[PDB]
Structure formats: C-alpha cells, structure tokens
Design a protein around this ligand. Structure first.
Ligand SMILES: O=C(Nc1ccc(Oc2ccc3[nH]c(NC(=O)c4ccco4)nc3c2)cc1)Nc1cc(C(F)(F)F)ccc1F
Ligand SMILES: O=C(Nc1ccc(Oc2ccc3[nH]c(NC(=O)c4ccco4)nc3c2)cc1)Nc1cc(C(F)(F)F)ccc1F
Lengths: 295, 286
C-alpha cells in the first residue's frame, strides 16, 4: 500500500458525475475535480479485506511504473470507507472503437499510422520493463484532444494482473516433460512473452481499417479454431491501402512468434518510421468531438 | 495448520530423509516431517497450499497427510512414513529395472491416483520414479517432492487465459485457451509413459543428454520406445505408444487408459510386495 493513501477522503477532491463506457468489466466513473473542474476516471472497487486489496493494488503498481507518454496516466489512489479508488486522467477524445461507431467509419491510413507508431512506442516501453499487455484492441486505445493515444488495459482480471508483470517458468523435470509443456512453457519468462502483443497490434490495425477484427462473424469460441487453422489475415481491399501498410501487416501477423519482429524493430518499418506528427489523428478526434457537440 | 501446539511435544526427530524422519512420542508411529522455515505470515500462506492439496488427496495411492503445525516460524507438514522408499532407489539398489508384472502394478496404481487427482482438478506435473513411494504391502504412495511455493497454486488450479479471442496470437490460442480445462491433465499422461520406460530401463529416454539439451530433443524427436522391444509384451508397447502421443488432444486420459489390457486385469499387488522385500534385503548387504 505504498501508492495508496488511507488518510485522504477522495470525496473531498472528486465528484462523481457519471459512468464511463458500458461497464462490461466493472464500474468506471466519470469524476469532476470539485475545485478545478478537471476530469478523471475513477475505478472504484469494494474489497473490505487487506488480502483482496493486495491483488487489486497490483494494477496501481503497474500504472505507477508505466509513466510513458502513450500509457494512461495514474493520478493517484485512495483506500477509504472500504473502497479502493484508482484515479486516471480523463482522455477527452474517447476510445478508438467508440470513435468509429460515432463516425460510422474506420480510420484512414494516416490516422492508423499515428496509432500504430504510438502503440509501438508504448509496447517498446512496456516490453523493456518486462510488462506485457495481452489484450490490445481498439477499445483499449484512448485518445486526447491533441491526437495522442493513451493505452489502457480495461479488461484483464485482477487475478491475472501479476502475470502481466512476470511469467512463471516451466514446471517439471526435463526428461519427463510432455511436448506441449516444453512448447508452451520453456520460453516463458523470456522476451518470447512479448511477441503476442505484436500480433494483436496487427489485428488492431485491421480492426481500425475495417471497424471489426478478422473472423468477427464467428462466436468467441469458434474464432479460436479459425485463428489456429487460417493463414494470417490480410486487408480486405488491398488496393485501398499502401504497400507499406500491407507489408507491415504481413510481417507483424507472423504465426511463428520466433520470427515475428519486436516493437523496436517495427519502429524502423517504413509504415511508421517517418511518422513524426499526430495531426491526422488529431483531426479524427476533432471530427468526433464536433459530432458530439450536436448531441 | 495448527498454531497452538509445539510439534516437538508430539514428534521426536530420529533422522533425516529438509525432511526429517519423526517418531510419534505417544504411539511410536513413523512419519516424515517436512519443516519449512518461513520468514513471515504471508510466507506461511504460500506453503499452506501444499497442505490444502494433501488434505483433499485422501486416496489410497497418494501420500497420507497426518497433520500440520506452524510454530516458532516453521511450518511442519507430517506425512505417513513409506517404509519401501521410492522406486528409483529400488532400481539403484538392485541394479536393474522392474519386471513387466511389477510395472503393471505401478502403472495400474498410478493411473488410479492420477484419475483421482484429475477428478479434483489437481495436476502433478513432475511424475517420475523418484516420486513413487512404496509401502511394505506393495502399494504406491504418489508424492510430489520438488514443488515450489509459487507452483503449488498452479497444481491446484490454472488461471483462465488472458485476452480477447479475435485479437489473440496463434501461440496464445495454442498454449493458453485450453488452460483451466481437462486439457491440463494430459501432460501427466505423457510423464506417466516416460516413468514406465524409466522403470523398465532404470533411466528415462535421452538420459545421456544434459537437462536443458533434452528439452530440444523432446521437441525434435518422435515419441520414445522401449530399447529391446521383444522383452516386453505387445500390450505394454501398445500402452506406451498410446500414452506417448505428442498431441495432448489425441492422448488418452487416465480413466481411458485404465481400460487398456496392460492394466485392466491387474487384481493383486503381489509383484510389488515381492520387489519391496527384495530391495530391502539388498540394502542389508550394502
Ligand atoms: O489501463 C488500466 N486501467 C484503467 C482503468 C480505468 C480506465 O478508465 C478510463 C480512463 C480514462 C478514460 N477516458 C475516457 N473517455 C471517455 O470515455 C470519453 C467519451 C467521450 C470523450 O471521452 N474514458 C476513460 C476510462 C482506464 C484504464 N490498467 C492497466 C493498464 C496496463 C497498461 F499500461 F499496460 F496499459 C496494464 C495493466 C493494467 F491493469
Ligand atoms: O507429496 C507432497 N509432499 C511430500 C512432502 C514430504 C514427503 O516426504 C516423505 C514422506 C514419506 C516418506 N517415506 C520415505 N521413506 C524413505 O525415505 C525410506 C528409506 C528406506 C525406506 O524408506 N521417505 C519419505 C519422504 C513426501 C511428500 N506434496 C504434493 C503432492 C501432490 C500429489 F498428491 F499430487 F502427489 C501434489 C502437490 C504436492 F505438493
């Protein structure tokens, strides 16, 4: 409980003014600073036991160390009246999936290029700290009005948070170990663990280009079979997209994690290597905000 | 775990097996005392998972928990002493592998134990002859000696997979999406097969390689077979060929293997009772 204040009443600072998202993974509240009017998200968790508090606090540990321009910003944490409050800077551009719904369209390639560049910067940062994300998707890409992303991890269970920090090495004695254990465990606790996010990044790019991820017509159990059996996904209409975009996807959506490149390697790929302005994404956010001003 | 009693008032330490040999001061019964020096209460919580596992595993062919204590910063786990020792020591002492009738009894009993464990969602994950303790009556007591505090939790329950299916990488689909299902139980069936070869030949396959190198050999090689196949029945070789399936999804369960003729007509442990007596008699010569 090093980064959790037990002596400050969060209600002295924050007024709950609504709820954010659709609450599928738990209640996240919109909070307004009673002095300044500044906005925050308040993830509030009822625990009542110091033991369970320890598990939820892992999220605070991760967020506190993940100080990078493109990761959601922890403002503070409180434990008061049997509730853990995790305060995160409000992202006034919303999530990319919500933007595509609001505007009834996918992103343009220049918009995708900004998201991709910044997601790679964030992943290179996380992986450098041995942190993995493991749930990349457009709904975890929040936006600021300046056109920058803030990467979130909304949907991971509290019990799985520790796995994002550190993987367990294999269980067994080698001579007796089953082939699937060798295959699936002996590379854990090495940078092999970071490669999954690179694939998910590729899928997220298709999701942003096409609104929905590949195989979206299937139910969530059936798609697992489709991923195992199918060649890597490609963009539906190649001619709409640059050869650089298609090549980036071909390299990231490598079914073999050993040959799939790292985030640092992909920062040199021509799809993103010259992306030094967020202006295309700033304009996407401006358009979404202008449409909300209608409502 | 009992906290109000000094275990030394109940048990005398009479030797070492850190696992001690202990003698009940009231009854003279012999036990193993696994004593773990813990630094804090949180540390005492991790180790207690082993007690949770052993307390639910009351099956005839699994080591028998007698009790547990926490006192003076040490957790005591008391397990019924197994006077036949472990199977690996038997083979070392006799300088020979087990006969096929002996392997049949071990295999039958290990399958019963594994079927029981898997029915409680417990996995073993370190099956080997050194984890097969023996009684004088010729019965096994399956142990799991080498587990770490961190890994105890995994033997008890696997975490659900992390991620949303449509976005998941193929290696995550392959290695994670079947966790927390009976897929988890299949690894033990392969290890059982290797243990049977170990008992037939003293050493497991690839024993000449170092432990990190063998991981590569397991991935690269066809399933192992018995070195001198004519010495072993069609049924034994077939049982192994079925159990040592590199694909866990086509590998059978313990319940399914209990129907195999290599073990399905085993009704007496006499072969193992004789083996234990022979091993003890050889130890007397050493
Ligand atoms: O990421 C989190 N937690 C977390 C918890 C709550 C949360 O709620 C938020 C925060 C800001 C928001 N801004 C908005 N805006 C709008 O709705 C909106 C509509 C119209 C305009 O604007 N909605 C928000 C919801 C966001 C994140 N955890 C986490 C992260 C990582 C990391 F580092 F690898 F990414 C690893 C492990 C982790 F556990
Ligand atoms: O299995 C344990 N723990 C454990 C801890 C200590 C232990 O010490 C023992 C116990 C009895 C002995 N008898 C002998 N006899 C001789 O040396 C001997 C020499 C000459 C003659 O005789 N040595 C023993 C050592 C045995 C087991 N854990 C565990 C089990 C499972 C399970 F269920 F799936 F298998 C899952 C998770 C687990 F954590």
């Amino acid at each position: 409980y090093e980064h959790v204040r037990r002596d400050l009443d969060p209600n002295e600072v924050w007024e709950i003014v609504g709820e954010l998202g659709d609450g599928a993974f738990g209640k996240v509240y919109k909070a307004k600073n009673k002095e300044t009017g500044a906005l925050a998200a308040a993830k509030v968790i009822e625990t009542k036991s110091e033991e369970e508090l320890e598990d939820y606090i892992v999220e605070i540990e991760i967020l506190a160390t993940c100080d990078h321009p493109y990761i959601v910003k922890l403002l503070g944490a409180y434990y008061h009246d049997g509730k853990l409050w995790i305060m995160i800077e409000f992202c006034p551009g919303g999530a990319v999936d919500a933007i595509m719904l609001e505007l009834d369209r996918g992103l343009t390639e220049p918009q995708i290029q900004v998201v991709c560049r910044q997601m790679l910067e964030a992943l290179n940062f996380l992986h450098s700290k041995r942190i993995i994300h493991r749930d990349l998707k457009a709904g975890n890409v929040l936006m600021t009005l300046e056109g920058d992303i803030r990467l979130a991890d909304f949907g991971v269970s509290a019990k799985n948070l520790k796995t994002l920090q550190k993987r367990d090495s294999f269980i067994g004695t080698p001579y007796w170990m089953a082939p699937e254990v060798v295959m699936c465990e002996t590379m854990k606790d090495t940078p092999y663990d970071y490669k999954a996010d690179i694939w998910s990044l590729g899928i997220t790019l298709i999701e942003m280009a096409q609104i929905e991820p590949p195989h979206h017509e299937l139910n969530p159990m059936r798609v697992l079979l489709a991923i195992a059996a199918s060649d890597p996904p490609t963009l539906l209409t190649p001619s709409k997209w640059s050869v650089e975009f298609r090549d980036f996807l071909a390299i990231a959506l490598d079914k073999n994690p050993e040959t799939r490149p790292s985030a640092a390697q992909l920062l040199e790929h021509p799809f993103v290597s010259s992306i030094t302005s967020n202006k295309a994404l700033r304009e996407l956010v401006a358009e979404a905000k202008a449409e909300v001003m209608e409502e």
